[model samples]
Structures are given as structure tokens and as C-alpha cells.
Target chain A: KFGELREISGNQYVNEVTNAEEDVWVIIHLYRSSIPMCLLVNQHLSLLARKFPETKFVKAIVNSCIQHYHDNCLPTIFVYKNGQIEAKFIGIIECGGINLKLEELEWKLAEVGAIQTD
Target chain B: KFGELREISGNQYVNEVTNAEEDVWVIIHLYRSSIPMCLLVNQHLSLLARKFPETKFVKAIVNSCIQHYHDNCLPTIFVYKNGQIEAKFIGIIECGGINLKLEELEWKLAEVGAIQTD
Candidate 1:
């Protein structure tokens, strides 16, 4: 019960992010399962979800949310608060690359006030 | 870490409820700590908060948020989604009174689509 990373579909985007209830932070991960970086981010999110259960952590295949989305943009992230995008990470480069530590991404999120820091 | 029932103040209403991030469900209880019914509801919310970490659970002294509040309205509950009140329970009688079971309150919330049910 500690971990919950929901894999949502493109159709659920509005309900999950745009129309999500207020005072909730929604972390969206656009990815492709075959990509190594995507898998890494997914793994990190699994732990993050457990760490911050108050934040909604969700993922979807890259192309599902964005038609013809290139793998180069795989693992792109969007942080939403009150139906508005507060932060975005376009590639692993901005997310500390494939060698990214969970804390690095966690800190980045906290900097944007998307996640709590202790 | 699992139990996170935040006690906010009247001055923090905008940030805690009105401007809360999107996609988060917020359950607010207006109560006075000395009231028996309020104490019971608070106990149930502590458990509910742990069970539904994804939802934001908050409370405030009834008079703090509402000036000249009546004890008759103690334990008033409001469910907010997207910064709007979706459901309101003004008195404990509707909440099953002093003998209320946690499951009863949980069921009422689920009926309003404020909490997830399985």
C-alpha cells in the first residue's frame, strides 16, 4: 500500500491533470517502456510515489499523449498544480541523465514546490 | 509517515484549500477539539488519512474558519475537488451521530465521489 504509480491513458489526461481536484500535485511521466532511461525514471517514480503519496504520480506511453512523439523526448515530465503546468523536464539530461539519483530529481521537484522536502 | 492529518488555520485557507494544486481531493473538517462528536470525527479522519494518503485531509477550529459558528454544527465536513465544494455535511447527525462508525463516514464520502471505494 506504500506504492501507487498509476499508468493512465491519453483520454484520462484531462481528468488526471487538467481537471484534477485543487491542492493536489500531479506528476506526469511521458515514456516508452522499451527505453532504458524511461525505465529508470519509472523505477524512480515508484519509490517517489511511496515517499510522497499525497502527490499523484502517473505515466503514459510517449505517443499516447503526444502523437508521433520521438523517443528522444522519452521520459519527459510535467508537473501540474491547480490544472496548470508548474515545471517540465524534457529529457534525462535535465533530470541528471541515465545516472540520475532519485534525490536529484526529488530536489528538482521540491525546488519548483511540486513535492515536499524534509 | 503514513498518518498525515494536517491541522491548518483560517488564515491558511486560500493556500491550503482555494489554491491547492489540481487533481487532489481535500476533505476539510470544521471542529472544536473539546466537542465529543468532533473528537470522534477527528479519530475517523486520522485513519482515513492513512488509508487514503492520496487525498488531502485537513481540519480547523470551526470558529477559526467561520466566525460565530454554532456548536450544533460541530464536525461539519466539506469535500473539495478543484477548489470547489462537492459535498457538505453540516452536522454529526447526518454523519451517524456520536456512535458513527468510520465505515459509515467513508461510505458517505465515496457516494459523493470524494473518496475511492473498492
Candidate 2:
């Protein structure tokens, strides 16, 4: 089956990441729909979701998830595996900025071992 | 400048690989468009071409490049560096079959040092 890109509320975050089945990799994109780069990352996630079904892809509005998820980090990425925060990308700059491509995102996720690149 | 995905003729192959400037990694996809997987690899190349401009990507018809280039190796990949064959993938199966994704191709290229994953 194709991988999915779904939305999760703030209340569901902890359980979603911490209680995910063993070996499941959960990737959460902390974003704001109003932010252009966040939207761009959403697009990238959707594509990556379909390409990597074994991993879980999810997105949440910045303030909705964390009241003070700084505006400077409007488009952050958090990777979880075995109930641990394995990697994080805190801002657009860390993610290649506006020039970031879908492949770049995939590479970053694979680098963290969240997905099997093979 | 954006990376490119170019085509090469049989006669141009030797010079292209052997004479590329120092430090340049040349990736050649020996393919036949008529083959489904070869066409898919070409699609992957076009996308990768833009993502990694530092690396060179080229495609050549299998038979046009080598009369006895086996059909079973229709989607072969050859990575050259410093005038030497650094790595080779002899068939579509080596490339993850029809299930191949753009990221997978990028990973394989990175695995052989043909592109910088970072």
C-alpha cells in the first residue's frame, strides 16, 4: 500500500509518536499553512508519503501543536523511531531553504534511518 | 547552474568519461527507451539531473554504445571518476525494478560517490 501523509492534532502528538508500533518510523512536520515554505514542505511530504509507505508522515499546524513553536521555525521536521526523537530540522535554512527539493527531504529522512533507502 | 541530463552517442562515450575535468564524477545510463524500466530511469535522471548539478548525468542507447550490450542489462548504470569506472549496476533489478523511486536512484548514486548526499 502507498504511504500516507495525514494531519494530527496537538493532543494526539505524544501518543502518536510514543505509541507507534515497534520499528515504525514517524516523521512529523511542524508547520503553518500560512507560511510558504511550510506549504512547500507539505507538498514534499505528500509526495514522499506515497513513495515510502513503510514510514509514517504527518503534519500539524505550528501554533496548534505548540503555542510557542517559534515563528522562526515555521517549518520544522521531527523524526521518531522506537519512541525516540532521532533527528530534527529546525528551520527552512537547515532544510535547504526555498530551494529544497523532494529528493533532498527524502535524503535527510533516510540519513536519520527513518526510511530504508534501499 | 542546474545539473543536466544529456544524451551521448557511442563515439562520444570514451572521450566523455575519460576526458571529463578533474574531480568530476560522470554517471552514464546505458539504456533503451523502448524498455519500460529504462524509460523510468530516464525520468529519474531528469529529476536527479536538476538536484545534483555538480554531478554529470548522461544517457546512451545500449546497442548504440556497445553492439553486444546485453538486453538483460537494459538499464545499466556506470559511474566514472578520474577516467576510471568507479561503479556499475548491470540491470533494472539492480536499480530496484519497476518499484524504483527517484530517491532510490539518488541513494544508489550516492552509495557509489557519484553524488554528494549531503
Candidate 3:
């Protein structure tokens, strides 16, 4: 379920309405065969996951067959909880800013008992 | 339809399915009330828009009354064309990469006669 996965079928593409899982999923639309932006996002997300182990993290790569490059935004980040998007980040900014946003989200999650702090 | 605009009501939010126009649109989600990241995104987007005058650009500020910060991702960018997403860049990895991606998309659009080049 990790590392160098093959592209899935277009019919398997998950739409917002069909995704009903209550988890913190970060879906990044990237072209792994072409650009390094996806790599950067993956690295940062890995670190974020390590720092905040209580949340669920996942990623998806957009393929030419599965998504049209012009219609599906590449390098898009969607933050979902309770089967609904709580936040979405399109591109990468400063890592520090991303960290701050994550912390803010974590604080909110903790308040709602979705996450616990040591 | 220009700068220093007031925030719209929640009911005015445009969902993907309801938006059926056939033009390029870029949307940046930011928290104007709390963070500078949004300001940074707006500035960069303005530069991008000026550089590519053929495309349409839009921004939405997430307010506490309308969106939950933990659920919504701030500073996200979405590029839509012909009632569908063509490309999206989340945070800023590097301005150079973004320019490359934009140019690439423009080339594709020109190839399909969606845009004309000099």
C-alpha cells in the first residue's frame, strides 16, 4: 500500500461525494513522471505525519488516463475529515506556514477530541 | 469585480457542479483575517494573472462564520477551464516550477485552440 504504486483505473478515481471515510486524507494530484513538486509535497507530508501520528494521511497521483491535465488540478492538496473537506491547499508555500496551519488544525482537532496531545 | 471586494455570503458559494462556464478560472482560498499566507498567495496570483492576461482569476477568503479552519485548507489554488479543472498548484514550491507548469498548460491550451499564441 506504499511506494512506487501503479496508476489506478480512471473509474477508480474517488470523487468528493463518494468518499465517505472520516479521516484526515491529503490527496495530492501530481505527475510523478514529470515534475518534482509532488516529491516535495510528499516529503513535507511525511514529516507532518510523523509529527502528528494521530491523524490519517493518504495521497493519490493523477494519471493521463485517470484525469485530464487541464481539468484536474495537479499538486492540489485536500484536507478532509468526517468525509468532508475541512481545508485545501493548492500549492506549496513556505514549510513554516504549512506547519503553522497544521498546528492550528491539530489544536482544533484536540478540542473536539479527534486528536490527543501528549 | 476588482480589488478590495467585500466577502460574499455562504449561499453565494459556487460549487463545482453548478459552475459550467468555459473559461480559465483560478481560485485561491485564504484566511484574510488571520494569516499572511493568504496575502502572499494573492500577490503571486496577481503576478500570474498579469503575466497571462487570457485567463480568469478569483479568490475566496474563508471566514470563521462560513468555514471551519481545520476542515478547510487555506492558501489553496485551483485552476479551472471549460467548467472543469485543468491544473492546480497548492502551496508554493518555487516560483520557477509554477511558471513552467503554467507555460506547459498554456501550450496545451494553444494546441487545442483554447488559447492563441503570438
Candidate 4:
């Protein structure tokens, strides 16, 4: 409910962070169902959305962020802090790989130091 | 003749490394056809096998090396140099993720200082 992923088109992607009243974290994921990993990431991030209130989790259009979002590498993560990108994890490798478990994903994201987890 | 992936069982997995004799890179891959990601990686790596002749490419069984080989996290790569495990890319995260392109994989492995490619 609180730290879950929000679905947005390409246009809204920028606004999600740019419009935030305060400086916060914006984590973006791009999705397409043709590839299976995208759906898995979607479900996993949904759980993460509630963990970090200060951070904003989103499922936005891949092309919205940049000109190209690698095909089949559906759910890439880009991290923004204070409207400037601190970093981004491109493809499955960056998002805890394809076979990620919920707890493992949490630990990996937590390992990134972007947010806290239990 | 040198450029292709080789399939090996767990017992052969050890000999594959121990018998290399000279300094070379052994890329051990664990696989199962069930996971969609594994097939993609297998196909991708088949192309890689030819690229690095000095490197030994292997498709080994899970639980060959250590006790826990992550399930559904097929096609893990363990790097061995000089008969010792110099490093390992545990899980899909290390193997170029789920949606890997052949070239991207080359660059990633090259980035790892594992081999040279053209």
C-alpha cells in the first residue's frame, strides 16, 4: 500500500519524481508480458512498494525514460535521488536476476543501499 | 571446431577443471530446460563457446561444486583459473540476466576480464 509499485506511462515517469514535493527515491520498472521475467518483477516490486515510504516505486514505459529499453529485459530498475539518478540496474542482472525470491530481492535492493529492509 | 558449448555432468565438472592443466577459464553452467531463462542463456552461450577458445565452456549439473545451487536459477557460471575458482557469477544475475544479447554478453564477460572477443 505504501511502498508498492505504481504503473505509469512514459510521460508520467519523469513527473513522478520531478513533481514530488520533497526529494525522494524513484525506482522505475518497465514491463511487457511477452517475456516472463517482467511479470515476476512486477509481483515482487508490488511487495516492495510498501516497505519504503520515502521511496517511490513505479512501473513506467521503458521508452519513456530513454530512447531504448532493451527488449525482453523488461523490468529494468533506475534509481533516482533528489530528481537526479543515483544509479540504475539495467536488465535482469541488476534486478536480482531472473530467479529472484521475494526475500532475496529485498536483500538485494537493501544491499543497493537505496532503502532499508527487514 | 573450438567454438561451441560442451555438456558435462557433475563428476565431469571437477575433471573439467582439474584436468585443464594450463591456465584457462572454465565457465561452468548449470541448467534445466524448465526455466525459460536457462534456454535463452544456453543458446547465447553456445555462441560464446566459440569466441573464447582458451576458455572452457561447460554445462554442469547443479550441486556439483558446493551444497546449494539455487533452483530455477539455472545456468550459473563459475570462473576457474589455474585449477582454482578465481570467481563465480552465482545465479542469472551474473550470467547477463534473463534477456541477454550475444554482444552484450561478450562485453559483460570481457568486462569481467575473463576473455577477449571480436
Candidate 5:
């Protein structure tokens, strides 16, 4: 799928398995025109992608465009691996807290042999 | 009245002057049960208060507890000075962006003699 997915509909169920391959996927639910956190996440994701070229990373905004997810909870972050959610960070968090979670995921990917140590 | 205020009703107009004193006040509107950003703001407010003991700082959550503000926007930030709003930062931002806003407020306070330079 080239790590890109489109919103189906408000009632469309999240095909977690099909949408997210056997790779690391991140879903960030934000509101319309709320670009502050979105920008920050994009920057971090870009850097992480460069750091771990072996892993796949994707971000989806769950607003009106993806009302299905926003209806549940906003500003929700879901981290999945191997087609299963491993960690979910909801709401906002300190940058440090976010970084800690990223580090944990990096280690997890390394342990699972999804990422090779240089 | 002390540097404290209470929510009246959803339609209650924000008595900006009455709520905000001559000192600098900050309002952080967040959703219910969302404490990540709240906690980070609390910590930063504490540290900033300590650094600039003369300036006043306040934070308000505009969620269920204060439905009035939440009706307008979620995760909105308002900064007031001299019983009037000086700067408003709506939506979430990187920690650096927040810090920059605080620095700007500090400088404004100093310029207006609300906060004395040591």
C-alpha cells in the first residue's frame, strides 16, 4: 500500500491489519486546522524515519476527514507493530514523554529483528 | 477579590477584567481526563513562577468542569495582563513554541512595569 491510506467513511471500521502492514505505524488524531502538534509529530517522524530506515512510519489525521476515529477520542495516538497495536498514547504529553515512548518502540523493533543494529 | 474566579454558566460571558488581575494570567483549556498537557503546563508554570516570582500566572481548563470555555474551543490558551488579554495561543504547540510565548510575556510584563527587573 506504499504506507499511504485514505479515510473511507465516518462509520468505516479501522482495518488495522490490512492498513498497517507488518511494520510500525502511528496514527495521530487531531482536529481540523490544528497544525501545531501535527507539525511537531511530522518533524519527529521524519527524523525517526531517517534514523531507522528499515522501519515504516505513517501518520493519519483523524478529524472530519477521518471522523470514524475522531468520534472516539481526539488527539489520540496509536502505535502498532506487526499489524497489532502495541502502545497507545492518548491526549497530549510532554515532549520528553513522547521521546521516551519513541525510544521504547525503537528498542522493541530492534529486539524483534525488525531493525538491525549498525 | 482574590486572584481566583469560578465558572458561571455555558453562556456566561467571560468577565475578563474581573477574572484577570493586573498581573499576568494564563489559561490553558484542555479536555476532561486529559492530563498530559495539563501536567506539563503545570510543571512549566511552576518553574516560570519561581523564575519570575513577581509576575502572576494562572491556568484554567475549559472542559466539563468549565464547560463555558470548552464550548468555544478545545485546547486553547489565553494570556492576560492588566485585566485584559494581551496574547492568545490557541491549540497545541511544541515546547519550544510555548517557551517562546512565555518569554515574550515575560518581556512584556517587564516593559509594562508589571514585573520589576532584578
Candidate 6:
């Protein structure tokens, strides 16, 4: 009931993660259709969500109105906890299933305290 | 010696705010070349950074490969504390020196515990 990869828009992004009943690791993947690598990671998120049901995995369409930025070509893996974004992974564009494995992503997620290793 | 608004890029962001000897509030303004609102806030941060040197104020030219997104027009004000991003201001793109005052921004910063109000 907790961890599932869900699609959300820019407007509802903040409320979804911050209002959870329990402190949850909100894994937000900023995505775009042009980035092929984003598609691959998109699949990885599905499996990861089930693996860590305690955490919340989210797919947000990057919005011009939401985040302040000029270039939206890159994919950023963001971990937000209790209304705070903890660690951000941008080099994700450089690492993916082609060069990196789901296990690699898993490890990185763990390092950021996004997954419970114990 | 703290709380100064400084200019930074995507590469050095996490380190500049996280590697401090003490825990600090890092205020980051995501800026673009075209947004005139960004200019006013940019001027304000210079003063704000000086006003709260205990907190680090950074003006970052948002990179395409850094945060993951596709829109290069809007400005986002981000708050990081103890290496965690505690608050995000995107509506900042909607508010600035014209309708909003620097004093108002200062209050918002205070609400996020970015300043020592006492």
C-alpha cells in the first residue's frame, strides 16, 4: 500500500510527499520523453518501488512552474524526507541500465538512506 | 564568519553547503538569463547574504545537467540545512521585488528557519 511508482504533476508534488502519515523517503525522478535514459530508469523505479514499500517512489513530469531552472534535459534523482530534499543525483544521466544496473541504483539509493538496508 | 550570499555553480553546490564546520542554512536561488524577476532577487540576495552570513546564500546558474528539468525560464528558491533541502520556493518565479518586497522574502526565509530572528 505504500511504495508504488506513481505519476504526478508539478503542482501536487510537494503535498504528496510532505503530508504522509509517516516519515517517508520520497524518491522523485524528474523525467522527460526526450531522454532515452530516463525511460530505462523509469522501468527500474517500478521494481524498486515494490522492493521498498516503506518508501514512496514518485515520477514527476518536470514543470516550468515547479522547479527553478533553465535546462530540463537532465534527470535528477531526488530523495526527500519529511518535506526536505536530502541527496540529489544528477549524474544519473551518465549512469543507467546500460552502464549501471538496477543494483547500482539500489546501492546509491541506500547510500542516501532512501532504502532500509537492514 | 557565516551567512553570506555567494555565487556558485551546479558542480560545487552540495559540497559548499554540506562541508561546513558547522550546520548552516543554505539559500540557493536558481536563476536564468531571461527572467527579469531573477535580477531583482539576485540584487536582494547580495544584501540578504550579508544580512545572514551564518546562512550561506548562493546564486547558482542552473545547469541543464544538474537538477533535471526542461524549462529554463523560471526561478526557484531552495533552502538547504544540515545538508538537507528543507524548503523549496518555485512560486518565487511568481513573486519578486515588484509585487513582493525583500522584507517579505526575508520573512519567508525566517519561517524556514533560515535566519536567526532573535
Give per-residue CA lDDT, model 2, range A1-118, as digits (tens).
Answer: 3388999765456567756778889999998887889989989899999888989888887654555457687678989987778998898887668888888988888877877745
Query: Which candidate has the top score in DockQ?
Result: 6
Across B13-85, the per-residue lDDT of candidate 6 in tens digits comes to: 5456544345777888877756777877877778888777677787776652144433433577878877677
lDDT by residue (tens digit), candidate 2, B47-111: 99988988888888866555545678768888999888899898878877878999988998998
Clashes of each: 8, 1, 22, 5, 0, 11
Candidate 2 ranges with C-alpha deviation above 4 Å: A1-118
Compute the lDDT of residue B106 as modeled in candidate 6: 85
- Candidate 3 structure quality by residue, lDDT tens digits, A6-76: 23322233332225344544333333534455655566555555665555555555442232343224456
Q: Tens digits of per-residue lDDT for model 5 on B19-41?
A: 54455453332332264544455
- Per-candidate DockQ versus the true complex? 0.01, 0.01, 0.02, 0.01, 0.01, 0.05
Winner on TM-score between 1 and 3 is 1
TM-scores of all candidate predictions against the true structure: 0.48, 0.48, 0.34, 0.45, 0.32, 0.48
Candidate 4: which pairs clash?
A: A3-A49, A3-A50, A4-A49, A4-A50, B3-B50
Write candidate 1's Cα lDDT for B13-61 as tens digits. 6567766679788888889988889889989898999888778888988
Candidate 4 lDDT by residue in tens digits, B11-89? 4554566456577777777776667777887787888888787677878555433334456456666667776766666
Candidate 3: docking tier:
incorrect
- Chain B structural similarity (TM-score) per candidate: 0.91, 0.93, 0.52, 0.81, 0.50, 0.81
Q: Lowest summed-lDDT stretch of 10 residues in model 5 chain A?
A: A5-14
Displacement of residue B7 (Cα, Å) in model 5 is 40
Superposing every Cα of model 1 onto the true structure, what RMSD results?
16.2
Candidate topping lDDT: 2
lDDT of 5 by residue, A1-118 (tens): 2333233221122343225455544342233226455455555555566676545554554442232343324345445555565555554452223344556545644444544435
In model 3, the runs with Cα more than 4 Å from the true position are A1-19, A22-118, B1-10, B15-20, B30-33, B64-66, B91-117
Off by more than 4 A, model 6:
A64-73, A93-98, B1-118
The lDDT of model 5 is 0.43
Off by over 4 Å in 5: A1-19, A23-35, A64-74, A94-118, B1-118
Q: Report the poorest 10 consecutive residues by lDDT, candidate 6 chain A.
A: A64-73
